[model samples]
Target: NSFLQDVPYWMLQNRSEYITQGVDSSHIVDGKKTEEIEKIATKRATIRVAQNIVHKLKEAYLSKTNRIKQKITNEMFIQMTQPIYDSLMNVDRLGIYINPNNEEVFALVRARGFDKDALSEGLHKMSLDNQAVSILVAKVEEIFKDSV
Candidate 1:
């Protein structure tokens, strides 16, 4: 599970200071002990399905970098991609649903328009990055009636 062995780097870093002393954090929680927390947090499917989707999304990302740097921070990648993801999730019409690998899908920031210069950046941005360029480009098999 992502929450278990894969604890977030910063979470472990800050919690390191408070761990033995006290439960001092205002943000982190032990859901089991918390009195009025939400009943459920999230749901997930298999990591394979996860890997398949995530790999594809990373490949679809358009912006690479400033070209002066070989790498960008994780924070930078989130700032780069989350906007486009949120925009696609909220857009009124996906009138043209382009799957990953069409350089345009990655260029859309908040779904407004092109900022394509840094677009199509390398996925060396993350460890999970790999040859999804092939899987991402694979053509449409079908879109179910209800899905459409």
Candidate 2:
């Protein structure tokens, strides 16, 4: 089987209410061992999941106030969303594949149910208007309510 093709299949198949996949790769340096490269790749993959979750919240917040002026700028929103992204960094590793030909290390990571809860709670903790919070939480919850 082709490892490159298998990677996406695993990611797509893993998407569900409690789980989704993030894949990332690191270039292997001449001096770095496989384990080091793998670890770096895995960390980046985990951050990929965090990035997605935070991006969703940012979009929701921006869209919610798209018509009128808003106090929460994108930078401020990102700063406020730090806690959610911090919690999202804790993820489970699904698989890793090394492309020996290219000297690249790839990792696939999974974020589960707890992430959904974290997203909900983190949004709640933000100082955004109540209606905005409700709208944002609904969007986050909707993602976890069904397969994306």
Candidate 3:
């Protein structure tokens, strides 16, 4: 069994139950240095994926609004979605693969089962005090559905 070439089946299958991004951890240098570098790259890839989810959430949230209003509410929604932002830290790690030939390391992270209740609640909170319009739960569900 060549453990060095082993990669998870889900990562290869590209399952919707998991979100996967292959990250470049750079070339092999020294053992200790490469180890730390790959570790940091894994962390970096997770953050990148989370940031992308946030971007999608923001775009979907803004989709209902007027173009002029979106300019101001864009920053406003960022503050409103802080709960979702914090929740993203709870992301899951599916697997990590290190190519033996080039010694290139790649990490696979999964953002499974997003909290739509929290997302809807956050958007509702933003609607109060005349800040923004109420985003319907159905719309929120649509967002969650499309996300997965």
Candidate 4:
């Protein structure tokens, strides 16, 4: 199955449970022991996956909006962009605390496989200065139900 297709289902089901249960770091890895412990570990992994999606969605939303407003130099546009930019920057800085386990995901991706060049290119394409980011983000969000 396509990764994109699986995202919503996994997020809605497994992700919801993980959030409600809260992270139990002791269950990070699989043990030689019980099925119960293994289930917990699996849930933890699912939570990480969903958290990443949430983070990306939020970043994409902010980046898209900022790029749209950046195009218009009117006072209202500038005022709007300023607050959004400030808020996004704060969120970015606080991400470490908000999702401390994300570092592991970064390490796994970096060590095994990643489309670094593609990511950089994509970010550049979606940059506020590029304007295209807004259009692309809009198109992506349209894939989801009730995104608007």
Clashes of each: 5, 0, 0, 0
Model 2, runs deviating above 4 Å: 1-19, 64-70, 80-82, 115-142
Question: Residue by residue across 9-125, what tens digits does model 3's lDDT show?
Answer: 643544353232323344556656766866766676665554555565566555766232334355664564464544443455556667778677666664555566665566556
- TM-score for each candidate, following the candidate numbering: 0.19, 0.62, 0.48, 0.27
With candidate 4 superimposed using the best TM-score fit, by how many Å does residue 23's alpha carbon deviate from the native?
12
Q: Best by TM-score, which number?
A: 2
Error of 2 at 23 (Å): 1.0
Candidate 3: residue 32 Cα off by (Å): 3.2
**Candidate 1: tens digits of C-alpha lDDT, residues 6-41:** 223332334233111111121214344322211111
What is the alpha-carbon lDDT of model 2 when measured against the actual structure?
0.63
lDDT of each: 0.25, 0.63, 0.52, 0.32
Ranking of models by TM-score = 2, 3, 4, 1
RMSD of each candidate relative to the true structure: 18.3, 5.2, 6.6, 15.4
- Candidate 4 lDDT: 0.32
Candidate 1 regions with alpha-carbon error over 4 angstroms:
1-36, 39-55, 60-75, 88-148
True-structure RMSD for candidate 3: 6.6
* Pairs clashing within candidate 1: 62-119, 62-120, 63-119, 63-121, 64-121
Clash pairs of candidate 3? none
